[model samples]
Each structure stands twice: as structure tokens, then as C-alpha cells.
Target chain A: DWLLTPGPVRLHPKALEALARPQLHHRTEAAREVFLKARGLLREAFRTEGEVLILTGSGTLAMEALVKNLFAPGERVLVPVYGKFSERFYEIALEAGLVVERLDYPYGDTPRPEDVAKEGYAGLLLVHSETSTGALADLPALARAFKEKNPEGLVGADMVTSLLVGEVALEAMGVDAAASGSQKGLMCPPGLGFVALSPRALERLKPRGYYLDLARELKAQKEGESAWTPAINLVLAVAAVLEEVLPRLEEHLALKAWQNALLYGVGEEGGLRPVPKRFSPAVAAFYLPEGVPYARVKEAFAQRGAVIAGGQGPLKGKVFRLSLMGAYDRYEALGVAGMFREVLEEIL
Target chain B: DWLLTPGPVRLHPKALEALARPQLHHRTEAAREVFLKARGLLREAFRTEGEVLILTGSGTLAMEALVKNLFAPGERVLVPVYGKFSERFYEIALEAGLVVERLDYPYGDTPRPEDVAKEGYAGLLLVHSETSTGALADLPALARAFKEKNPEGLVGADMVTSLLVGEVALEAMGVDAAASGSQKGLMCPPGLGFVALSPRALERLKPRGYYLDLARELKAQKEGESAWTPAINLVLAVAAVLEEVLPRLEEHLALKAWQNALLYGVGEEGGLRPVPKRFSPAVAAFYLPEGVPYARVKEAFAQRGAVIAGGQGPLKGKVFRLSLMGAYDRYEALGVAGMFREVLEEIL
Candidate 1:
């Protein structure tokens, strides 16, 4: 079956094979070799020369790692909340006892750089590609504005679905830390979280908890080891995927082309329309056709061996999400659009 | 090669096969089925009828989860520190802002129930099996004493190396909460943390951070879902192993016999001797033979296709650890002992 979801996307074949291998102890030379190689590959993928820590959890763990490590309790941070994921970052900051000032926007709307109020905040948290609404933030411009306004303020981003599916030059965007997951654009299963920390973030780190504490993580990863037992198979799987993906980012970029091709093939016919004004290449979100319920459409696609995502939060039943993730060819992408058209014809 | 280390143990073939399967979206019915089935099997393993939260991180995440969820900041808790794992729980409680009162002991010494001072504490945290020293704590007696002294006090445990290898009847032990990992006795890779919360622990849950918050995890698991993306392959792998292991816990118990067989086979010959007075069935801790460096022993074992763990913390280079943590047969267990004899003959 085709897994067409924003995150937890389809696994690359190499990664699947890597997962089936035997377990290796984390404190071994062999394990250290794999660990360091994966770190180098992730650094290449993240476009960062700084330290990247691989954590054994979901994307939210990485988000919290950035929050707890880079800032102190009661420090004021700005969160731009436009979608569910952005609100998630805001919630994490609040839960960590940070004084959060939010720039709230309606779902499917993008906040511009000029819209970022000049607040003397300690840090700025944002989502580069808000998966909940399939809206892309102009991160370079927003980060530039945040830095220009508050030069000493830290900048962190949730790039869970944004890292490989979109352009994420951490240095170019002035992002101090970026958090991501394995299953999204990295083309692996859902178990690992990666955080790239710039020197600035590293210098300011005061690790809060034990497991997700990036401070200990940094010390261990520097020596090609982990502070605790990591998910060995998943680490191997991610290393396998990154080794294949980083070499030809152009092929990964073809996923964005696939997104465009799917949208073009659907052609906005039969009342099915795109949902967001500024779109993320990772996923294609569309409002359900005027009279057709999402259940029928979902079932139609399911019968044809395609798995899709329904709306989340307030958008439930009114919207459907299809992902342009994974290493598929142009023909496969167009074939998905063909399947979508067939489902629409039967349901509508 | 035998993964004879304390953890990241050898995988069962069923689990290895499950890991290579295709990815499933976490929000789907198929994923929900796998998640809840794993939870049920884990409950049986833990001997708990209460909620079992499956977290996607190391065992330390579960240790921290209990601290954050069951107690508020500045609440006083008692931590019995002996080995490295117990010290880890102590450190986690301290980092969480709990007013920690510690019962310190030498590395291999077990603290008796009476040793637990009758303090007006809010919670009591202990480790069932001290992996570093291979000492097994009398958790049932200790927990009983804690509850008898302070009826309203919460009882928590880190059962990372204890759950399957040793006895962990949460109700019988009066343990309010227990945290464990996927690797040690579960015969899976390292990526998941399981926490069993009793009715009493559930009543006082105040979830702190974002990822390992048991309150959100409890609500999601009850509905056969997760608060965030879980390690899907690991969930399926645990379910597969449990299905094979639980029906015949006699076979799982045989692993302890394997531990004894390895020890009985080694027989304290030469200068080598068991480290801890109270032994754990999960692993065998032995002092390196006089004038036989661990480097030679480790290398000899590696050349013969066996992996073992060196000492940790202050015990480094003085002690070594081996495990019987898998679904291996009696012959295989004896065979490991045979190989160990060969390595010792060459090293000595």
C-alpha cells in the first residue's frame, strides 16, 4: 500500500533492509562507527557544520530538547502559531515554563517577516512547513527579521516535515537549532529525532531532563557514542537512508515536482480545491468536494491500495491530505494523481 | 554472534522479521491495532491491569515520566542509590526539582526494607535490578515497607533490566508505577519505554513536559492511539516477541537458568569471581581474573563471535558483564559458557 502521509512517510527500501539487521550494543566500536557515519550524513542533510544529536523518540522530543537546552525557565520566547504543529511548539514552550508571546494567525495563513512584531524576546520558535495546513513559512525572511530585530535572540525551528522535502539551509536562515523526525523527509521509520545545534545554541545549553538532554547528547555524539541506549536498528536505518539521500538532493527535490504534478493532474476539477495559499512541497492539502463526504473518498482510495490522511483538529472531515514524500519517480507520482482522479470520479 | 551484553540484547527472529515490514501511518486503524496489542501483551508481562504507556525513547524517559507525572515540583521523594541505574533514578528526580532524600549504599549492596527511613516523603523511587552491579533488590519487601510506613506515598521503580528476567508483579509488590525498556528482557531493539501506572498513580498524574508526559500518553493509549508518532516497527516487534514469549513464560524463565548455567559453567575458577552478593538473573557480573586484563578477554570473545560488556563508572576495567537476555535454547546458553571457558584459558 502507498503510505501518503505528511510525516511517517514511505520508507526507502534500503532503510527497511537496514532495520532487519541484528542488534548492536551502543558501547561498541562497530556501533560507534555506524553512529558517527550517521551523524556525518545527517549533518550533510541538515546543511550544518554544527553538532547534530540523534535522540530515540518522536519529533516532539527534539522540539522539547531545543526548548529545554537553549533557554532558561521564565525566559520570554515568541511563537508564531498558524497551524497545529506551530501550536505544538508553543505548547511545549509553555509547558517548559517559558513565557510565550504568540503571533496567532488563522489556519492556512502565512505570517510575513514584516508581521513579526519587534519584541525583545529571548528566543523565536517557528515551523518552517506547518504540516497541519500544508502552508510554508518564509523562514529565511522571518528568521532574518527576528535576528535583525533581536540580534542576541535564539532562533529554533520545527523542521519535522520541512527538512528534506523543502529547502533548509540552517546557516543561511540564521536558525540556531532545528528539530526533525526520521520518518518525514529522511525516508525512514518513525523512531528517531534529530536536532542540529549551532555554536550559539550549544554555548547557551543548560540541559533540563535526562534522556532528551542535548548537553549530555552533545558530549557523547562528539565522541561517537550515545548517553543512553539508542534505537540501534532505527539509527542504522536512518544512516542507510541519509547515505542514499544526501548524495542526490536533486532526486529529493523531485518530490516537490511530484507534488506539483499531482496538483496539476487533479486540475482543481470537480470542486476539489487546494486548501492553503502558501503551500509546502511535503504535502498537498485539499478541501473535500462540495457534496462528497471524506469517508467515501477515503474508502475509495483505500480500496485502491492507497492510504491517505484526513483532516485534523477543526478541519476534520472537511479536508484531506496527500503526501509527496518518499523516493518515487515521476510516473509513480502521476499514477497517484490518476488514482485520486479515479476515486473522485467514483465518489463525486 | 551472541549479543551477551546486559542490554540491546539478541533479537528474536520474529521481531527481526517484523521490523522489515512496511510503515503504517500512526493515526490509522492498522497502526492502532498494533499499538494496543503491544500494550496488552506488555500488561501481561508486567502483571498489571492498569494503564501501560509506551514511550518512544530509552528507559531513562520512563524514569523521568514517573517523576514528572506523579509528583509536583519541590515534592520530597526518597531514592535508594546503590548501582549506576539506581543513581540514574536519583539524578532524574534531582533534575526534576524534587527534594530528594537518598539512601546511599556501596555498589553491590542491597538496601533492606528496614533501611528505608520512615520519612514524610511524597514518593519512593527504587530500581529492581541494579544492572551495573548485577544485584537484585527485594522490591516487594521494600515497596511494602514504604507503603506501610507512608500509606499515601507513591512507589515507583526502574525495572529496565528486571521486568521479564526477574519477577515484576506490580500489584503484589505494591508498586504504584514502574518504568522499563524494550531491550533488556523483552528481546527487542532499544527504542521504546513502557510505564505501568496503578490506580493510585493515575489519580495523582500531573504531566510535566511534552513527549514523555504519562497523562497525555495514558489518554491516547486508552483509545488505541499515541499522543505523537510512535516507533511503529518497534511496537510490532514487541508484539511479535510477546506473542511468542508470554504463552510460555517457562521458556522466558529458562533465560534465568541460562544466566545460572553460564555462571555455574564459569565456576569462579582462577581469580574470577561474581561481583554482587545478590545476583540478578538478567546478567552475570564478574571480576576479571588476576593479571588477565579485560582487553584480552574482550578481544578473545570478539574473535570467537561473542560480544560482552565492560565495567561502567568506577568499576571500569575491574569488572565485566554478560547477559542471557533472549529466546535462546539451553544448548546455546551452555555453549556460551563453553566459549567463555575457551577465552579464559587463552587469556589466563
Candidate 2:
């Protein structure tokens, strides 16, 4: 199936073939060498000098680890919710026995930095780019606001959807901890989660448990290895993707811009409204006409051999998301856009 | 280079290929289906009708999870130390804040069942087949003794080495919990760890913490899923290995018996002795001559294209181990044994 979903997207043939290579022991010299190289490249990609720990889990696992490790029970975290992903952070933090004070904005709008500053919390958490609804928070301004509000409070961000596509320097943004996944801007398959911790964040982290202990993993990485047996094949694929595909980040972003423009142009011409006018360049979410159902549009496009994703959670059946993230050439993107337009016209 | 380490041994060609398959989303129907099937197959392999929870980690990680989840802080656990693996269980229990009491035994001898019974600890932990010194604990007798002494104390076994080869009926042995790894008897790469918990054990387990919380994992598995994103490729390889390579209990045990007999006969002829006369079908450990440097002997074997392991921890440089578990054909075993004999002759 042509996966135009946000994650588990199509992989390049070379990247797919890399996974088929012979497995290596996680502690072997060969595996260590590859892991070290990949880790260095990923840190550079995130534009961070802080330690990066990669785990074999979904992004939510890293999120859960962050809260459990960095904060004590009943600690308060300020979460600015713009979409579903931010709400997830709040949910995970609450599940970890943390008190959450939410600063929420409308689904299509980003929260103001000053508004977040008004709430006094032990830490600040925000999603840099919300994939559920195509909205990008102003990270630098938000970071400055959090610094001004409570300089001692830990500042964390979720960069899952915009690590490489957007200009997010995790270290410069004053984020104590930042996490992302391979299935998004890293342009690899899902199943690998990455988290970067600032020195301050590291100090605040206590051992929550073993498997998802980010501190333990960070320590192991400093010695050029992982504490646990990592997903060897995934790590190898990540290494290959970093070496061959990472250099093309600029080109990929440029293509995303073109796709975004096409999507916006189609919306303007057909009198359809994009979910959020300020696009993420990674994914484009939009709504059908007043009388049209988004699910029907998704299915109609799928019938035409272009798989699109309907919105999830509260927005389900209310909007559709088209991804221009990875493994998509110009022709493919244009064809999907054309098919989407045709499907909408037929449905409308 | 061929890997002959205790765990993370060489994977079969088909199993290695399975590791290279495209990653699957953990929440997807495909992943759930794979997990359900793997759990069922693993239950059969473990000879348990209880629940099996798979985690993404090394064998030691599974060991940690088993200890932390099954026993509370300050709870007494009896660990019989024959070598490194068993000692590690004790260490893990201690690290988890459990009150661990050791049942000390010689490096090459299994602990006496009657002695273990006298301890009357809250839990009993031991390696069914100790890989470090190649000692096989008498599991049936040990179980009977423990049951006779205190039926309420939980009995946990590390069957990392003996799972498929030893014909262990976990349920029949009255084992409360048993753990194994894919790299050993499962004939796959070293990334996935499996745990089979008896009904009584499951009822007694507490939600220790996140990540290693077996109770949470079991709850999730009821819906045919995992608590975290599992190592998908490794699990796929495990499924393939179990379906294609797992032998009938009688057939597997017979092969191990033959291999052990060969090792014993060769050791008797060469004037070198296998550590345990009744050795585990899993691995063979041999002590070098009183003053001969084992390092030299290990290097000599490596030069001849056979990678044998040196003794670890207390037995370091005193003994050499030859592992004969998983995907190791009869010819491969013979070749390894021949290489060892050839290298020994030159060194002696």
C-alpha cells in the first residue's frame, strides 16, 4: 500500500535494503562503530551539543521516560496544548503522577509565549510541530518566555514532526530535553525513538526504571555503546539512512515546500480550506467543503491509488492529512495532489 | 567471524533475513497479529500454559524485569551461585532492593537440592543451565525440594540456555516464572527477551515500575499488544525461527545428549575434563591444566577460526566454554570440537 500516513511511510530502496544486511551484535566492534557514527550524525541533525539517547520504542515511550525520570511525583508541568500531540504529553505526565496545568489554544492556532509565561509551573512542555493538526509553535519565543517566567524550571519540547524540516536548535532553544522519532523528519521507518538531554535535564533525572532509563542509555552512549541490546537491524538502517539520506535534508525540505504550495494552491482554487493556513511543510492537513465528508474523500483518493490519512481523535472524519515527508518524488506528490483534487471534485 | 558466545550467538540465514523486514507500526493490526502468534509459539516452546510477555532487551534485561516485577523491596529471594549468570541474578535482586540470600556452590557443581530447600526464602532463583561455568542445575529435584520445603515461595528459573534443548516442562517443575532469549535456544539474533509467568506468579507480581512492569504488559497483551513498541524485526525473526527451526522435545533433547556425550568422551580421552561430568546440553566448560594459561589456549583456538569464550568473573582465565545451542548443527559442533582439540594439542 502507498502509505501517505504521517509515519511508517515509504522507505527508499537502499534504506530498505540496508535493513536486510547481516545482523551484528550490539556490543561488537562493527555495531558500536555504526551506532557511534549514526549518533553523531543525529546530534548534528538536531543541532544539539547535548547527549542523545536512542531507544527502541515509539515517541510516547520517550515522552513517558522523560516525565518519569526528570520529575518527581506530584510535580507540576506547564503544557501548552495546540493539538493532539501536546495533549498526549499532558496525559503521559499525568499518568506519571505529575500535576499538569494546561495552557491551551484553539486547534488551528498556536499558543502565545506570554500566555504560557503567566502560569507558574515547575516545568514547561510544548510540541514544536503538531502533526495531528498542521500547526507549528514559535519555539524560540516560547523558550524565552519560559526562561523569563521560571529560569529554574525545566523546559522540554517534542520535536517529533519537525526535527529536520524546521529550524529547531534544541540547545539554543533552551529546551532541557527534546525528543523525536525516526518515522518523522529523520526519514527512516518507525520503531526508533531519540531523546536529547541538556546537562540541567540530566541532573534532574533520577532512575525511573531500567528499560526506558534515558540517563543509563546516555551514559552508555558516552562510552560508545548502549546499556541494553539495541535493535541492531534498526540501528544499522538508521546509520545507512544518516550517511546517505541526511545530506539531502535541504533538498527534501525544498520538495516539501513545493508540495505545500501545491496543496495551498489547490485549496484556494477549489474553495476548500486547509486545516491550518500556517503549514508545517512536513504534512498538510485540510478540510473538505461544508457538505462533504473527509472520510469519503480519503477513501475516494485511496480508490484512485493515492492513500491519504483522515484526522484522528476529535478531528477524525473532519479533516484529512497528506504527508510530503519522505520517499516521495515530485511526480508522486503531484499525482497524489491531483488525485486528491479529483476525488474532492467528484465528492463535492 | 563466527560468534560462539554464550548469548548473541550466530543467527540462522532465514532468521537474519527476517530481521531485515520492513518495520511495522506497534499499534497496527499486523504488529498485533505477529505478537499474538509469537506469544503462543513461545508459550509452547517454554512448555507453559501461562502468559508470555516479550520485551525488547538482552537476556540480562529480562532478568532484571523478572526480579523487579515479581518481588517487592526487602523481599527474600534465594539465589544459588554456581557461576556468573546465577550471581548476576543475585546482583539484580539486590539492585532492585530485594533481600537476596545466596546458596553458594562450587563453580562447576550444581547446588544440592536439599540445601536449597533448607533456606526457606520467599523466592528461589537459579539458572536451569548456567552458561558461565557450563553447569546444569538439577531442575526437577530442585523444584521438588523447593515445593516440599515451602510451596508458597515463588520459584523463578533462568532458562536462557536450556529452553528448547533441555525439554524443560516449566509447569511440571512448578516454576513460577521463566525467562529466555532469542539468541540462545530460539535460534535468532539477540534483541528480544521472553518471560513466561505462571498463574500464581502473575497474581503475586506487583507493578514494580514502568518499562519492566510485567503486570502492565500482561494487561496490554490481553488486547493482543505490547506496553511499548517492541523490537519488531527481532520478533519477526523469532516467529520464523520457532515455526521453521523449533524441534520436537524428544528430537531436540536427543541431539543435545549426543553432543554432550561427544564432548565428554573427547575430554576423557584427551586427559582434559569437562567441568561437570553431567554437563548441560547447552554448553560445555573445560578447565585448562593447573598452570596452563587459558588466554593462550583461547587465542590458539581463535587463530584456527573457532571463537571460544573465556571464563568470566570468578572463573576468568581458569576455564574455557564451548556453546552448542541454537542453529548449531551436528557438523558445526563436531568442527568446533575438532578445532578445540587441534589447538589444544599444539598448545599442550
Candidate 3:
């Protein structure tokens, strides 16, 4: 079966082969050389001049690290809650005893940059792309707002879903720190989290609350390694993916855009309505016509060998999300779309 | 070259084969079954009835997690500083904003339990076996002292090197919480850490200050999983090791005793006394005779195909350590001992 989840995406043959190689000792010369090259490559991919620390953790773990290490007790942070992940930041910050003011937008709506500027909190956190809701916030505008509001206020962004699939120049956007995972756009697996910290963020960073300490990771990376024992094979897979597969990101993005366009045209032609006519090129979310249950259609589509995501949270059962991320090409996307259409027609 | 480190030690053929398997989906039925079984096996290995959480981190990371999650801010914790790991606990606790009081013993000398009790701290933290100095603390006596002085105070121990290889039952020793890595007596690679919590420790646990939060881990475990993406392959390797390679406690303890006796005899005959002569069958530390040069002896032994550990901290260049834990047979022990004797003869 073709895996089409947001993460734990399909790996390139070269990357898989690299992962299959014998494990390298973490402290050996061979491991150090590979680790250092991987660090440099990741820095290039992130478009950041500041230090980047690769953590052998999930994306959320890196997010928790940013909150625990960078913000002290009662430190103020402004988090824009656009979806589930945005709320997760609030939860982690509150648990860490930080003063947090959330700018919560509805699941499908992106927050206005002006509203963010008005809040003027100590740190600004935004999700460049919301995977749960399939929405890409206007990142440039958000960055501009944060810059204009308080230049020193650390800007932390989660680019977990946007890094490779979308064009986001993190350093140019003036983000103080950013985190992403190896799954989604990196096209590796789910066991690694990458964080890049700007000079400002580094200066403010404290000893991490514990295992999620970025400073320790940074120290190890500087010496050509990770603070803790990394998933060596996974790291190898990531390095291989970056070397052999990441070059095709633009091509992947074009395919995604094409898929989105086809889905949008289908909706327009068939008198069906999409959640947002202009949705993220990364994922397409469509709303079934009123009085039509989406579960039946989704179940039918699954039976026909096409698995589509149903809406989550408040939008559950109201919308269908077709993720075009990962190794899915135009042919595969078209085939799924055709299957989806056939299922929907049968159900209707 | 043969790999010979304290950890990341030689993996059994079957365990290595398990590690070589394709990654399992974390939330899939197959993975959950494996994860649940692994948790039970780890709990049994830890000899704790409270609860166990397995994380994808080195032993040190588990140490960090124990301190960060179980203790709240401003709590007092007493750490017995004898070697590198003891100092490490103090550092981690201090960094977590805990008020730390350290009872420091001379390197290679286990602290007197009564003296530690006299400090009257809220928590007693210790290393069951100090890997750096090859010193084994009298755990039962220490636990008794802590219990007598402050029954409510939590007792934490790092059994990373001693667990499964020693005769002590971790829970029976009155340790409220114990942490261990996969690499040592567990006979697997170094990528997973296990934490066994006592009922009291679990009750007193607070919001972990960060991602390595044991409280969160426990909750996830209850839901039949890990709080984060686990090193699944490593967990599999651990299961295989525990089942196929882990000898019965009696046999394991006897083997260690035999190796320790042999090393101790070598030390005495060569006028190089084993530090902490009341050796805990897990590791043996031998101090170099005056003008012997510890590094020279270590290098010489390495040339003869045996790797011995050099002294760390206060004992650096003054001693060498030989680990006999996990996958070490009497023959392998004799080979290492023979190399040491050959090197000493040449040097003398």
C-alpha cells in the first residue's frame, strides 16, 4: 500500500539503502564526518546562518524543548493557536509555568498579522503551515508583524509541514528559532526533530528543563555529534534523503500544486464546494454538499484503494482533506482523485 | 576492529537481526503489541512493580528525565558525588532549578550511608555502580539510612551499569525510582533508557519541567505507548536481548563474581590493588602502581586486543577499569585479564 500520511513518508531508494548500512559508532571518525556534513546540509536546507541542533525526537519534542529552554519562569510568549499544534504550545507553556497569551483563530482561518502586532508579547510563535487544518498562514506578513512589534521578542515558528514543500526563508523572515521533523517534508521517517536557533534565541536559551535541552545538543553538534545517542540508522536515512531526494522538493511542490488544481477544478465542475477555494497547495480540503454525509464517501473511497483524511475537531465529518505531500507524484494523485470521484458519484 | 566499550557493547546475533528489521509504524497494531510487551519486559528487568517507561535516549537522558519530571521546582535533592555520573545528577538537578546538596566522597570510595543520611535532605540520589570509578555503593545500607532519616524523601538510583548484572533487586533495595540504559547489563545497543518508578514516586510526581517528563511518559504507557516516537528498532533489540541473551540472575551474578575475583587477584599479584576491593561483580577498577602510567597500560592492553577504561575525574591517569557486565563470559574475562598481565609484565 502507498503511504500517504502527513509524515513517515516514503523514502527514496538511496536513502533506504543508506539506512540499511551498518550502524556507525557515534563517537567514531566516520560518524563525526557524516554528522558534521549532515549538520551543514540541514543548515543549507533551513536557510539559516545560526546554529542548528538535530534532536532524535518527534517534532513536538523539539517544540517542547524551545519552550522549556528558551523561556524562563513567568516569561511572556504570544502563541497563535490556529490548530491542534498551536494549542499544544499553550499547553506546554502553561505546564512550564510561562505567561502565555494565545491568539486563537478558528481552525480554518489564519490569524491577521495586525492582530499579532497588537498583542506585542515577549516571544511570538506561529505555525507556518497547519497540517491539521490544511492551511498555510501568510508567513511573510506574520514575520513582518513580529519584526515590527518587538525586534527582540524571540520569533519561534513550526515549519514541520512547510519546510521542503513550501518556500520559507526562515532566517530572512527574522525568526529567532524554528523546528521541524524528519517525516513530513524531509521525506525520511518520524524519529528525528531539527531545530535552528538564531543568535538572539541562543542568548536567551537556558539550560533545558531536561532531556530536551537544545544547548546540550548545540554543544554536541559543535563538536560534531548529538548530546544523546541518536537513532543512527534514522539519521543516516535523513542524510541520504537530503543528498538524494531533497533536490526534488520543487518538483514535488509542482506536483502538489497540480494535484490541488485538479481537485479544485473537480469541485467547481461537479458543483461541489471546497472548504476554501484558495487552499494550501500542500493539501486540499473539500467540503461535501449540505445534507451529504462524508463518512460514506470516505469509506467508499477507501474501499476503492484511496484513503482520504476526514476533518478533525470542529470540522470533523464536514470536510475531506487530500494530502498531496510526500512522494506522491501526479499520476498517483490523479489516480486517487479519480477513485475519489468514482466513490463520491456512487455514494451520491 | 573488535568493538569494546562499556556500552554500545557487542550485540547478540539475534538482537542485531532484530535491529536490522524495517521500521514499524508506531501507532499500528503490530507496534503497539511489541511496545506493550517491551514495557512489561523492561519492568521485569528493572525489578520494579510501580511502573516503567522506556524512552529513546541514552542512560543519561533517563537520568535527566527522572530529575526533571519527578521533582518540582525548588525541591531539595541530595546527590552523592563519587564519580562522573554522581556529579552529572547534581548538575542536572541544579540546572532544573532544584536546590541540590551534594555529599562528595573521594573517587573510588563509596560514601558511607550513615553520613549521607545525616544530611537530612528531601531526596537521596546515587549511582548504584559508579561506572567511571568502578565503585559499587552499598545500596541496601544507603536505602535503609535514607528510610530511617526521611521515610517520605524519595530515593533515586542510577542502575545503568549495575542493573541485571548485580544481585540486588532494585525495588527491594528501597529505591523509589531507578534509571538504566539499554547498553550496559541489558546487552543491547545504546539508544534506549528505562525508568522504573515506585508507587510513592509516581504519587509524588509533578509536571515534568520538559519533554522527558516521566509523568507524561507514564500516562502514555497507560494508553499502551510511549510519550514520544520511541527508537522502535532499539526497543526490539532490547526485547531480543532480554529474552535470548539475559542470563538468569544467579548465573549472571556468579559470572560477574568470577570475573571480579580474577581481576582482583591480578591486581593484588601485580601490586596494583583494585580500588574498592569489596567489588560488586559488575566492574573492576585497578589503580596503577606508582610510576606505572595508567594510559600506557591501557594503550598496551589495547594493542593486545583488549580495551580497558582509563580513569576519569580525580582518578584520571591513576587507574583503569575493566567492565565484566553483559555478554561477558569467563573466557572473555580471562582474555582481558591475560592482556592486562602481559602489558604489566612488559611495562615492569
Q: Give native contacts recovered, as a fraction, per prediction.
A: 0.93, 0.27, 0.23
Q: How well is candidate 3 docked (DockQ)?
A: 0.31
* Alpha-carbon RMSD to native, per candidate: 1.6, 3.6, 3.8
Cα lDDT tens digits for candidate 3, B238-329: 77767763456577677777877787777678777777734666677877877878767767866776555677788878877776564667
Query: Which pairs clash in the backbone of model 2?
Result: none
Give each prediction's DockQ, rounded to 2 decimals. 0.85, 0.34, 0.31
Output the better candidate (1/3) by TM-score. Answer: 1
- Candidate 1 ranges with C-alpha deviation above 4 Å: A267-271
Question: In what order do the candidates fall by DockQ, top score first?
Answer: 1, 2, 3
lDDT-based ranking: 1, 2, 3
For each prediction, how big is the interface RMSD? 1.0, 3.2, 2.8
Model 1 chain A: lowest-lDDT 10 consecutive positions: A258-267
Candidate 2 lDDT, tens digit per residue, B1-348? 556666666667778677556545565667789888898888888877788888866777688888888888888778888888898788788777888778787888888877778655788887998888778888878877887878778888999988876877676887889888877777776667788888778778877655567877889887878775576667887888778746556777788778766766666677787787457877778888777898787778667765667787878878877766646678987876786678768777
lDDT, model 1:
0.84
Top-TM-score structure, candidate number? 1
Q: What's the C-alpha lDDT at position B340 in model 3?
A: 60
TM-score of predicted chain B versus true chain B for each candidate = 0.96, 0.94, 0.94
Candidate 1 lDDT for residue A100: 88
Q: What does candidate 1's lDDT look like per residue over A100-136, in tens digits?
A: 8888898888888986747688988989988998898
